[PDB]
Design an enzyme around this catalytic site. Structure first.
Site, mmCIF file in Angstrom:
data_model
loop_
_atom_site.group_PDB
_atom_site.id
_atom_site.type_symbol
_atom_site.label_atom_id
_atom_site.label_comp_id
_atom_site.label_asym_id
_atom_site.label_seq_id
_atom_site.Cartn_x
_atom_site.Cartn_y
_atom_site.Cartn_z
ATOM 1 N N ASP A 115 41.436 50.431 30.650
ATOM 2 C CA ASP A 115 41.168 51.416 31.693
ATOM 3 C C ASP A 115 41.353 52.845 31.165
ATOM 4 O OD1 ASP A 115 41.711 53.094 34.228
ATOM 5 O OD2 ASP A 115 41.231 51.144 35.106
ATOM 6 N N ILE A 116 40.447 53.743 31.558
ATOM 7 C CA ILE A 116 40.494 55.118 31.060
ATOM 8 C C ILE A 116 41.619 55.938 31.692
ATOM 9 C CG2 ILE A 116 38.986 56.255 32.729
ATOM 10 C CD1 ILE A 116 37.533 57.475 30.285
ATOM 11 N N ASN A 137 40.815 45.094 44.049
ATOM 12 C CA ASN A 137 40.697 45.982 45.199
ATOM 13 C C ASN A 137 39.382 45.731 45.922
ATOM 14 O OD1 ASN A 137 43.118 47.254 44.506
ATOM 15 N ND2 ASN A 137 42.066 48.761 43.210
ATOM 16 N N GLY A 195 41.312 50.512 48.123
ATOM 17 C CA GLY A 195 41.299 51.482 47.051
ATOM 18 C C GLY A 195 40.169 51.326 46.060
ATOM 19 N N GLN A 196 39.116 50.581 46.401
ATOM 20 C CA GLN A 196 38.028 50.361 45.451
ATOM 21 C C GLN A 196 37.246 51.654 45.218
ATOM 22 O OE1 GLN A 196 35.427 47.051 46.399
ATOM 23 N NE2 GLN A 196 34.416 47.119 44.381
ATOM 24 N N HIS A 235 35.970 44.004 39.578
ATOM 25 C CA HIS A 235 36.814 44.132 38.420
ATOM 26 C C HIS A 235 38.243 43.728 38.723
ATOM 27 C CE1 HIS A 235 36.342 47.967 40.551
ATOM 28 N NE2 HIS A 235 37.614 48.282 40.281
ATOM 29 N N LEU A 236 38.813 42.941 37.817
ATOM 30 C CA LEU A 236 40.202 42.519 37.881
ATOM 31 C C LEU A 236 41.069 43.439 37.017
ATOM 32 C CD1 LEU A 236 42.214 40.046 38.656
ATOM 33 C CD2 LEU A 236 41.712 39.312 36.295
#
Lengths: 113, 115
Positions: B32-33, B88, B94-95, B101-102
Site C-alpha cells: 500500500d502506498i 471495506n 471507508g472504501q 481489495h483485501l
C-alpha cells in the site's frame, strides 16, 4: 466445532443470537459489539487461525465472506460495512477459531485499529 | 482493458508501477502506498469486482484465494506475531477504490475496535 467458546456455540451448548446457519458455517451477533451492527461468521470446521488454513479451505473461506455480505444486506447495512479477520497476538485474535467480523451502522475509521 | 481503469486495474496491467509481492493468474499482492502499519499490503483479484456487496456466489473460491494468498504473503514477509485482514465496503466501510481489495496489516500491535 472445537475446544473454544465458538465450538460451544456451534454445538448449541450456550446461547447466541443466530442470524444464519447452513451446513458449513454459522453467523451470529457479537456479544461485545463495537458498532450498531456487529456480527461474526465462523466455519463449523475447526480452523484455529487463518495462518494454518490449507489451500483446500479456499472455497470455505470465501463462503464466509459471501455469507457475511448477504447477512449484512439482510440486516440493512446499505451504507456499507467492514469485514475483519484477526490473526495472532498482533492481530488481536480473541478466540482461536477462525472468525470473520462484520461491523456496520456507523462510520468506520482509518486506520482499522 | 481487462481489470478496469481504477488505479488497481492500471496496476494489474503494469501501466502504473507498484511494489509487487506475489502474482498469479487470479490475484496480485502489492504494498500500500499509504501504509497504516509497518507492513501493509493489498491482495486484489485480477477479475474486476467493484465491491464485496456485488460479488457473485461463484466468486467464493476467488475471495477465499485472496485470503490464502494474504496469509502466505504475511508469512513470507515474516509477520510471525500476527496481522489483521480488512475488507471495506462502501461509504460507511471507508472504501475509496471500487475494485475489491483485501488489506493485510502487521508489524505492530493492532487495536480494537478496528476503526
Amino acid at each position: 466445532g472445537g475446544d473454544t467458546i465458538f465450538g460451544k456455540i456451534i454445538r448449541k451448548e450456550i446461547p447466541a443470537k443466530i442470524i444464519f446457519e447452513d451446513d458449513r458455517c454459522l453467523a451470529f451477533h457479537d456479544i461485545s459489539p463495537q458498532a450498531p451492527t456487529h456480527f461474526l461468521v465462523i466455519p463449523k470446521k475447526h480452523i484455529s487461525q487463518i495462518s494454518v488454513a490449507e489451500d483446500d479451505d479456499e472455497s470455505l473461506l470465501g463462503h464466509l465472506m459471501i455469507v457475511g455480505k448477504k447477512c449484512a444486506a439482510d440486516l440493512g447495512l446499505n451504507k456499507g460495512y467492514r469485514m475483519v479477520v484477526n490473526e495472532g497476538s498482533d492481530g488481536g485474535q480473541s478466540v482461536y477459531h477462525v472468525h470473520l467480523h462484520v461491523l456496520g451502522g456507523r462510520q468506520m475509521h482509518w486506520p482499522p485499529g
